[PDB]
Design a binder for this molecule. Structure first.
Ligand SMILES: Nc1nc2c(ncn2[C@@H]2O[C@H](COP(=O)(O)O)[C@@H](O)[C@H]2O)c(=O)[nH]1
Ligand SMILES: Nc1nc2c(ncn2[C@@H]2O[C@H](COP(=O)(O)O)[C@@H](O)[C@H]2O)c(=O)[nH]1
Ligand SMILES: [Mg+2]
Ligand SMILES: [Mg+2]
Ligand SMILES: [Mg+2]
Ligand SMILES: [Mg+2]
Ligand SMILES: [Mg+2]
Ligand SMILES: [Mg+2]
Ligand SMILES: [Mg+2]
Ligand SMILES: [Mg+2]
Ligand SMILES: [Mg+2]
Ligand SMILES: [Mg+2]
Ligand SMILES: [Mg+2]
Ligand SMILES: [Mg+2]
Ligand SMILES: [Mg+2]
Ligand SMILES: [Mg+2]
Ligand SMILES: [Mg+2]
Ligand SMILES: [Mg+2]
Ligand SMILES: [Mg+2]
Ligand SMILES: [Mg+2]
Ligand SMILES: [Mg+2]
Ligand SMILES: [Mg+2]
Ligand SMILES: [Mg+2]
Ligand SMILES: [Mg+2]
Ligand SMILES: [Mg+2]
Ligand SMILES: [Mg+2]
Ligand SMILES: [Mg+2]
Ligand SMILES: [Mg+2]
Ligand SMILES: [Mg+2]
Ligand SMILES: [Mg+2]
Ligand SMILES: [Mg+2]
Ligand SMILES: [Mg+2]
Ligand SMILES: [Mg+2]
Ligand SMILES: [Mg+2]
Ligand SMILES: [Mg+2]
Ligand SMILES: [Mg+2]
Ligand SMILES: [Mg+2]
Ligand SMILES: [Mg+2]
Ligand SMILES: [Mg+2]
Ligand SMILES: [Mg+2]
Ligand SMILES: [Mg+2]
Ligand SMILES: [Mg+2]
Ligand SMILES: [Mg+2]
Ligand SMILES: [Mg+2]
Ligand SMILES: [Mg+2]
Ligand SMILES: [Mg+2]
Ligand SMILES: [Mg+2]
Ligand SMILES: [Mg+2]
Ligand SMILES: [Mg+2]
Ligand SMILES: [Mg+2]
Ligand SMILES: [Mg+2]
Ligand SMILES: [Mg+2]
Ligand SMILES: [Mg+2]
Ligand SMILES: [Mg+2]
Ligand SMILES: [Mg+2]
Ligand SMILES: [Mg+2]
Ligand SMILES: [Mg+2]
Ligand SMILES: [Mg+2]
Ligand SMILES: [Mg+2]
Ligand SMILES: [Mg+2]
Ligand SMILES: [Mg+2]
Ligand SMILES: [Mg+2]
Ligand SMILES: [Mg+2]
Ligand SMILES: [Mg+2]
Ligand SMILES: [Mg+2]
Ligand SMILES: [Mg+2]
Ligand SMILES: [Mg+2]
Ligand SMILES: [Mg+2]
Ligand SMILES: [Mg+2]
Ligand SMILES: [Mg+2]
Ligand SMILES: [Mg+2]
Ligand SMILES: [Mg+2]
Ligand SMILES: [Mg+2]
Ligand SMILES: [Mg+2]
Ligand SMILES: [Mg+2]
Ligand SMILES: [Mg+2]
Ligand SMILES: [Mg+2]
Ligand SMILES: [Mg+2]
Ligand SMILES: [Mg+2]
Ligand SMILES: [Mg+2]
Ligand SMILES: [Mg+2]
Ligand SMILES: [Mg+2]
Ligand SMILES: [Mg+2]
Ligand SMILES: [Mg+2]
Ligand SMILES: [Mg+2]
Ligand SMILES: [Mg+2]
Ligand SMILES: [Mg+2]
Ligand SMILES: [Mg+2]
Ligand SMILES: [Mg+2]
Ligand SMILES: [Mg+2]
Ligand SMILES: [Mg+2]
Ligand SMILES: [Mg+2]
Ligand SMILES: [Mg+2]
Ligand SMILES: [Mg+2]
Ligand SMILES: [Mg+2]
Ligand SMILES: [Mg+2]
Ligand SMILES: [Mg+2]
Ligand SMILES: [Mg+2]
Ligand SMILES: [Mg+2]
Ligand SMILES: [Mg+2]
Ligand SMILES: [Mg+2]
Ligand SMILES: [Mg+2]
Ligand SMILES: [Mg+2]
Ligand SMILES: [Mg+2]
Ligand SMILES: [Mg+2]
Ligand SMILES: [Mg+2]
Ligand SMILES: [Mg+2]
Ligand SMILES: [Mg+2]
Ligand SMILES: [Mg+2]
Ligand SMILES: [Mg+2]
Ligand SMILES: [Mg+2]
Ligand SMILES: [Mg+2]
Ligand SMILES: [Mg+2]
Ligand SMILES: [Mg+2]
Ligand SMILES: [Mg+2]
Ligand SMILES: [Mg+2]
Ligand SMILES: [Mg+2]
Ligand SMILES: [Mg+2]
Ligand SMILES: [Mg+2]
Ligand SMILES: [Mg+2]
Ligand SMILES: [Mg+2]
Ligand SMILES: [Mg+2]
Ligand SMILES: [Mg+2]
Ligand SMILES: [Mg+2]
Ligand SMILES: [Mg+2]
Ligand SMILES: [Mg+2]
Ligand SMILES: [Mg+2]
Ligand SMILES: [Mg+2]
Ligand SMILES: [Mg+2]
Ligand SMILES: [Mg+2]
Ligand SMILES: [Mg+2]
Ligand SMILES: [Mg+2]
Ligand SMILES: [Mg+2]
Ligand SMILES: [Mg+2]
Ligand SMILES: [Mg+2]
Ligand SMILES: [Mg+2]
Ligand SMILES: [Mg+2]
Ligand SMILES: [Mg+2]
Ligand SMILES: [Mg+2]
Ligand SMILES: [Mg+2]
Ligand SMILES: [Mg+2]
Ligand SMILES: [Mg+2]
Lengths: 38, 196, 94
RNA sequence: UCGGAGUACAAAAAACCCUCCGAGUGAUUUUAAUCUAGACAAACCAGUCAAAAUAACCAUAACAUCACUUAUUGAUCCAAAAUUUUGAUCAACGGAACAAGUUACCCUAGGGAUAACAGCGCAAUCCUGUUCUAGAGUUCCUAUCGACAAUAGGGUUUACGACCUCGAUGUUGGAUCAGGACACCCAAAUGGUGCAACCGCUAUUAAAGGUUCGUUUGUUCAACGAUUAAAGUCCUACGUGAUCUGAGUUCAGACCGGAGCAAUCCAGGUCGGUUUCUAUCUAUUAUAAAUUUCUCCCAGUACGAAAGGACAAGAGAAAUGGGACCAACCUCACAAACGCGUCUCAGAGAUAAUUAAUGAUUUAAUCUUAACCUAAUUAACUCAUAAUAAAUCCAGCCCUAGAACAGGGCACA
RNA sequence: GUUUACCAAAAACAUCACCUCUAGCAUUACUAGUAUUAGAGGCAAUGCCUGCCCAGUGACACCAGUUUAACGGCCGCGGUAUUCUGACCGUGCAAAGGUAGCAUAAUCACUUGUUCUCCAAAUAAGGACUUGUAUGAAUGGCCACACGAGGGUUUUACUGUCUCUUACUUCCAAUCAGUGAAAUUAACCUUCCCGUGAAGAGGCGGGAAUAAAAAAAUAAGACGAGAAGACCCUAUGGAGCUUUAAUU
RNA sequence: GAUAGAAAUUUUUAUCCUGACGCUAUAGAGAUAGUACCGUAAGGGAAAGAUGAAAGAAUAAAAUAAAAGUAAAAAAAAGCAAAGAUUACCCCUUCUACCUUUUGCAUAAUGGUUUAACCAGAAAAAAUCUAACAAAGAGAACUUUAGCUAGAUACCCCGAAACCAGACGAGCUACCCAUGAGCAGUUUAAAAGAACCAACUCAUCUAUGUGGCAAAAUAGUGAGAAGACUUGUAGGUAGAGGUGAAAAGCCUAACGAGCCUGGUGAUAGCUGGUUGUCCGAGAAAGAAUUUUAGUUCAACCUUAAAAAUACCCCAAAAACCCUAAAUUCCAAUGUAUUUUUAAGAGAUAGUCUAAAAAGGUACAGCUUUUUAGAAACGGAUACAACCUUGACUAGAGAGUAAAAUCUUAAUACUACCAUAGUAGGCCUAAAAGCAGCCAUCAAUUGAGAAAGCGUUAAAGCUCAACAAAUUCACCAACAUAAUCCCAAAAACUAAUAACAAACUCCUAGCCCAAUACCGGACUAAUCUAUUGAAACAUAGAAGCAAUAAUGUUAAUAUGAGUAACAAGAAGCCUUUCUC
């Protein structure tokens, strides 16, 4: 049993890992890249 | 193999049945005395202050040549000792100087004791190394006495204190004694290299 | 060669098993279903004051039926046929 | 044993050899009764509140008060009083009426529920790297280090935990045989030097092969002597006791110093002290295709003011290890075996680190997780090459062939 | 000389010698003995000695008092020696405060104390210093001859102990013929590597390997066989021994 | 306290009617017998029988040829030895032997070679059910405010070290008492607890041996050997003891105190074992306790019976300095659960995960509290605790669930010339942009009294400045272990695919898992009372069921035809040769 605050990143439950993977940030993507657009 | 795990327990969870700071101070005093003897006596060449510590028997006691005589320099390579205050102990002073390991052969002139500076030679350096080893052994004996006193204090406290506590303090004192005797050996080796 | 200290899944150092796209898709589907559920659970047909005692006679009648069913517990009737049918074990042919 | 606060943040409860306060009662007078609803708390025993009604004081209170007021306390039985009460650091505080030490001379029932060895988890401790430069280094952080700090890894030491074994996992050290890792001691290829040369100091790559003999000590270690190309660090149940020893540890005997009145004991010393196994199963029971030192020339050359003084190239000798063999010497009273004696030991490719050629992204340069061919380059490892490599006669008898079975011969004579 | 018959033969016990106590006495020991004797003990011949102490516990004394060759004990504190004194100077407490001797011992640790001889090299052995704050004088202290299957250390001599093993015989061994056990055994159709797993896998997972049977060898594993671990802990389980344990 | 336990006073009519719901050779007496055999003795103590009317029917006749162990008939890659199967024995796919103990065992934790026969739950106070009679019941003595009487339902086996009493043991050994006997040779005025060394007595060291020749030996080597010596015979000392040149030795192969018998079926909170089928429900710990290896209560749970509210529970309500997740109490509502009454046992030695904490090293597969979950025959390759899953049967049907290769492996910045007051002023040997301090102006279209190298100080090399063109430009990259790396491989044919359970539908049903404890229905084999008479039915009884106790007895296998064991030669046959 590890403490709530540790030094080894305290690997999570698999359900929590799946939750974070699902809730990962998704940046918006424009339809056409504007760099060498008009 | 590491083979020796150093322990520094707290000295502060104890504070009362033994004073580790006091023991360390005593061991440091032993080391300082050894270094002071090495510096004062065995530099390269005998000086009037170098033979001021040779004990001379007087009235069934031990007294120093500086205490029972006046030591000065007459010639650049000569030492003059005036035993005017204690003319009786002249022969005892000669015995002290002659069987002193510092290689001083004195000449008896009634009361004006004449000690020439022999030389700085390979033989003289060997005798100085022998004296350094003798003084290191005497300092080791003094350190052993200091450690024995602390062990006696632990024995005095060994009726109500936990056996594990006593064992840990004994191990700590042994570790300090080992460190100090290692320092003594290092100082002796350095002095031997300096002389030779 | 690459040992996992202790057990695979309990210790401080566990197995670094990752999260798959299938697992992400399954969780997303479950989240969509729960969002639909919590939408449907938003607007009630009746209010708290309107539902007050709307079906209470039925609950009282159900409890009374349960009490009657429990109270009807009693040993069964003993009939003469049950006792006299044991003699039939020795019926023979004349 | 009892109470208060935190753990236990908001009904109650809630543990630790968790962190702090306390109690085993004092002072004073208002000397504080009986009976009874209903409740709190609680395994039980115990602990707490309390309306109405009763006799005496204001004819309007009585819950004794204060010291954080919460704790200031003890059951039956049994003993004593004058019949109404009292009596325990029974403090191991739900309390046996009254009872110690030692056992290594020990025994029995169990426990891996619980220790010593090993394994296992962790990495406090230990060991490796990198990040950061204040400082040393004459100036100059990084030639060599590098405090205060950061971060990652290994599981060699001590400790921590008590998960497998107590209807037995037999211990240190040594002998024999070693398998493996590389964090390379030697041998090999290089980079930087505060690298002139010889010695050196660091770092990169490489684990096919090596890594001595002696005095003391049971010793692992350690000191010392003589050498070596070097006398590496570790893992393997601190490898290996159904292969060996028992010097130490750890049984029964006995001295010494001490402790205890004694029995007896000491993380004290010394002498002596039974080390079993007939192998059932798995596993195994021989192909090669070298290494390293030393002597001479280079050469007293390069390099150096001089002292000092190489590398590369070229010749040999020796040792070790692998495989063999008796002409002689030696062991040798069998014709043989044997070492102390004799013979032999190798070509190509391939690479890691690191050097340069050509040349874009980036019309310059740039060895290129840019293509094209490039060359100088460790050890491994493969392959040239070497060995075996003609099937179905086998009774008997010999054999430099063999446990048995097999294998070679039996026509010269 | 004796001892743990069956893991210890010793330095342990006994021993001559020297000391303590207890006894003035008759028909079964002592003893058919009578204090130059007989019992209960200590230490160990011999040589030099055996220092101080009756405060406490014993024993005589039935209270004082006496006894240590009875049980036993034989100082603490402050200062001085550069640190380090056991020596000294004072002080306090005691019944006295360790005398002679020996001494890093078979003597807590420090410790492989220091020095010299022995060796090319020694934590070994011997000599000397020694302060052993825990030596020490019949629970005996020191030396000495002789003795010892006692425990250590040297010198030649000797050798297969060893450098470094070799040859040959006998018993073993292998084959043939006869007779013919034992521990052991859940069933096995009984591989290797890595990982996992009650944390060391032949049996699980992922891979490699894989005609089947004999015979002879080696012991790495089967946490091999043997003995319901003797070490450790528990048991309101035992037993031996000692008492300042409780009842007597 | 555990427990022990009367009396005064009452009842009891002679004899036969007696045999067996007792056993049938591992049973019943130990018994074919207290015999063989084992011990000096007291004492312990067995196993062993099967033909037939006739064996004065053995050129003998019939029933079983059914246990383990073998032979008939050795084996062919691969694997808890089997199952799904299949044309087909293997080849294919799937399953970590069984009890016991544990938080958890394939575990390398215990037990077992196998077969056969024996081997382990026993009591009626209170209670439940059934029945008789009932203010009374009972065939005498008592209980009675529906009770009294009767019947049926219930509580194991093996195992110590030990303790006490009485016998038997000194033929071994310890020591004595009688009676005898031995010591040869050599050196010594010696028979001197002297010396060498035999017989003889001991047993120092080593090597074999270790189920051996031997429950203490063999070989070599050792000590004593005229004495405190060895030894024969016989006697004595006996266990709260004897004896002891103290080793706590020896006292008939085990002595910190002998052995046998009896108490004795000693006692074990400790270990092991505990024998038919199916079904229903089903428990992980709060307090005391010489107590934490155990019990007794409480809380849970089982079996019956009475009832009526039981969980979920919106407001409103629960403290004062600050305080989160959330708690307590409650209508409605969705379900049917809950409370009392009577019997009760097991358990009270726990694991991980998620969360709030504490100790430790903000370490542990670490330890202690509170809340929740789990302990799949699916998935995470293997797996306890993680995830999916309201656990029955048959099907060669179907739909779903969790879940099956995770992310980057990245950092280039190039020409172009740099002159002036002036070596700015001080300090300094020198300080010229540069050990240092202060000012930091000014010439040129444009260049800091100078942002870095360099010189002792200068010099010199760059940066910024102008003039020339001007892709993009801020941080981000980091070694290793020991038997042998570890599925193989794959960057584009359309994917909210498909394949995938004890889940859910489909077709039928006998219509939902389980450890300790609890309840129920059946039932194998015996005996008895009545049926039945090619082997049964209803009742009543128990010596009433064994894959497990290092279980007892007997027989069998493995080890294993293995370890080990033995007879000198020839000959005219018991005569000569070699030791
Ligand atoms: N003092 C006291 N002793 C009691 C009590 N109950 C029993 N006892 C016993 O009675 C005895 C009294 O003996 P005492 O101590 O007076 O000589 C002891 O054994 C004691 O334990 C009590 O309540 N008080
Ligand atoms: N005390 C207790 N033990 C249990 C419980 N459930 C199972 N056990 C014990 O656990 C063991 C069996 O494990 P299971 O089969 O339940 O996994 C048995 O020793 C059994 O007695 C329970 O609820 N409480
Ligand atoms: Mg936790
Ligand atoms: Mg693991
Ligand atoms: Mg883990
Ligand atoms: Mg209540
Ligand atoms: Mg009132
Ligand atoms: Mg108590
Ligand atoms: Mg208590
Ligand atoms: Mg209480
Ligand atoms: Mg002893
Ligand atoms: Mg035992
Ligand atoms: Mg436990
Ligand atoms: Mg250890
Ligand atoms: Mg081990
Ligand atoms: Mg351990
Ligand atoms: Mg192990
Ligand atoms: Mg740790
Ligand atoms: Mg780590
Ligand atoms: Mg500097
Ligand atoms: Mg290890
Ligand atoms: Mg354990
Ligand atoms: Mg635990
Ligand atoms: Mg064990
Ligand atoms: Mg076993
Ligand atoms: Mg090797
Ligand atoms: Mg490397
Ligand atoms: Mg090198
Ligand atoms: Mg190597
Ligand atoms: Mg280790
Ligand atoms: Mg080992
Ligand atoms: Mg072994
Ligand atoms: Mg060993
Ligand atoms: Mg052996
Ligand atoms: Mg030994
Ligand atoms: Mg010894
Ligand atoms: Mg001996
Ligand atoms: Mg074999
Ligand atoms: Mg063998
Ligand atoms: Mg050369
Ligand atoms: Mg050779
Ligand atoms: Mg170019
Ligand atoms: Mg270039
Ligand atoms: Mg080839
Ligand atoms: Mg042939
Ligand atoms: Mg003798
Ligand atoms: Mg005797
Ligand atoms: Mg004897
Ligand atoms: Mg013996
Ligand atoms: Mg002897
Ligand atoms: Mg012996
Ligand atoms: Mg003696
Ligand atoms: Mg005398
Ligand atoms: Mg004595
Ligand atoms: Mg004497
Ligand atoms: Mg005296
Ligand atoms: Mg006295
Ligand atoms: Mg007196
Ligand atoms: Mg004493
Ligand atoms: Mg002083
Ligand atoms: Mg002396
Ligand atoms: Mg000592
Ligand atoms: Mg030696
Ligand atoms: Mg000393
Ligand atoms: Mg003394
Ligand atoms: Mg003494
Ligand atoms: Mg005395
Ligand atoms: Mg001798
Ligand atoms: Mg002797
Ligand atoms: Mg030879
Ligand atoms: Mg057996
Ligand atoms: Mg096989
Ligand atoms: Mg493994
Ligand atoms: Mg597999
Ligand atoms: Mg496999
Ligand atoms: Mg593979
Ligand atoms: Mg083996
Ligand atoms: Mg196995
Ligand atoms: Mg083993
Ligand atoms: Mg074993
Ligand atoms: Mg046991
Ligand atoms: Mg043992
Ligand atoms: Mg013991
Ligand atoms: Mg107890
Ligand atoms: Mg008893
Ligand atoms: Mg007493
Ligand atoms: Mg009582
Ligand atoms: Mg019978
Ligand atoms: Mg058969
Ligand atoms: Mg198969
Ligand atoms: Mg498992
Ligand atoms: Mg259990
Ligand atoms: Mg366990
Ligand atoms: Mg295991
Ligand atoms: Mg296990
Ligand atoms: Mg066990
Ligand atoms: Mg097993
Ligand atoms: Mg079992
Ligand atoms: Mg077994
Ligand atoms: Mg009844
Ligand atoms: Mg008794
Ligand atoms: Mg007799
Ligand atoms: Mg006799
Ligand atoms: Mg004679
Ligand atoms: Mg003699
Ligand atoms: Mg012999
Ligand atoms: Mg011999
Ligand atoms: Mg002899
Ligand atoms: Mg002799
Ligand atoms: Mg003699
Ligand atoms: Mg007794
Ligand atoms: Mg006796
Ligand atoms: Mg003794
Ligand atoms: Mg003894
Ligand atoms: Mg006996
Ligand atoms: Mg019993
Ligand atoms: Mg218990
Ligand atoms: Mg069920
Ligand atoms: Mg209960
Ligand atoms: Mg509310
Ligand atoms: Mg409600
Ligand atoms: Mg318990
Ligand atoms: Mg835990
Ligand atoms: Mg829970
Ligand atoms: Mg459960
Ligand atoms: Mg599976
Ligand atoms: Mg389910
Ligand atoms: Mg300008
Ligand atoms: Mg510029
Ligand atoms: Mg590296
Ligand atoms: Mg499906
Ligand atoms: Mg279903
Ligand atoms: Mg029946
Ligand atoms: Mg039965
Ligand atoms: Mg059976
Ligand atoms: Mg056995
Ligand atoms: Mg059995
Ligand atoms: Mg056989
Ligand atoms: Mg044979
Ligand atoms: Mg065999
Ligand atoms: Mg044989
Ligand atoms: Mg013969």
């Amino acid at each position: 049993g590890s403490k709530a605050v540790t030094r080894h990143r305290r690997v999570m439950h698999f359900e929590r890992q799946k939750l974070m993977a699902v809730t990962e940030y998704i940046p918006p993507k424009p339809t056409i890249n504007p760099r060498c657009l008009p | 193999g590491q083979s020796q795990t150093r322990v520094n327990i707290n000295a502060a969870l104890v504070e009362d049945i033994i004073n580790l700071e006091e023991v360390n101070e005593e061991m440091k005093s032993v080391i300082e005395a050894l270094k002071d003897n090495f510096n004062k006596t065995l530099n390269i060449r005998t000086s009037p202050g170098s033979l001021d510590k040779i004990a001379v028997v007087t009235a069934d006691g031990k007294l120093a040549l500086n205490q029972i005589s006046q030591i000065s320099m007459k010639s650049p390579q000569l030492i003059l000792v005036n035993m005017a205050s204690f003319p009786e102990c002249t022969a005892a002073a000669i015995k002290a100087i002659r069987e002193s390991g510092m290689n001083l052969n004195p000449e008896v002139e009634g009361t004006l004791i004449r000690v020439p500076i022999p030389q700085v030679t390979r033989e003289h350096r060997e005798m100085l190394v022998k004296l350094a080893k003798q003084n290191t052994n005497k300092a080791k004996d003094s350190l052993r006495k200091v450690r024995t006193n602390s062990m006696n204090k632990l024995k005095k406290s060994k009726d109500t204190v936990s056996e594990d506590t006593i064992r840990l303090i004994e191990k700590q004192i042994s570790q300090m004694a080992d460190d100090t005797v290692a320092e003594l050996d290092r100082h002796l080796a350095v002095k031997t290299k300096e002389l030779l | 060669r690459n040992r996992i200290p202790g057990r695979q899944w309990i210790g401080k150092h566990r197995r670094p098993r990752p999260v798959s796209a299938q697992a992400k898709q399954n969780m997303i589907r479950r989240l969509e279903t729960e969002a639909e559920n919590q939408y449907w659970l938003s607007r009630p047909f009746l209010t708290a004051e309107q539902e007050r005692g709307h079906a209470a006679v039925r609950r009282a009648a159900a409890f009374q039926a349960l009490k009657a069913a429990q109270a009807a517990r009693f040993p069964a009737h003993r009939r003469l046929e049950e006792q006299l049918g044991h003699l039939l074990v020795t019926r023979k042919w004349s």
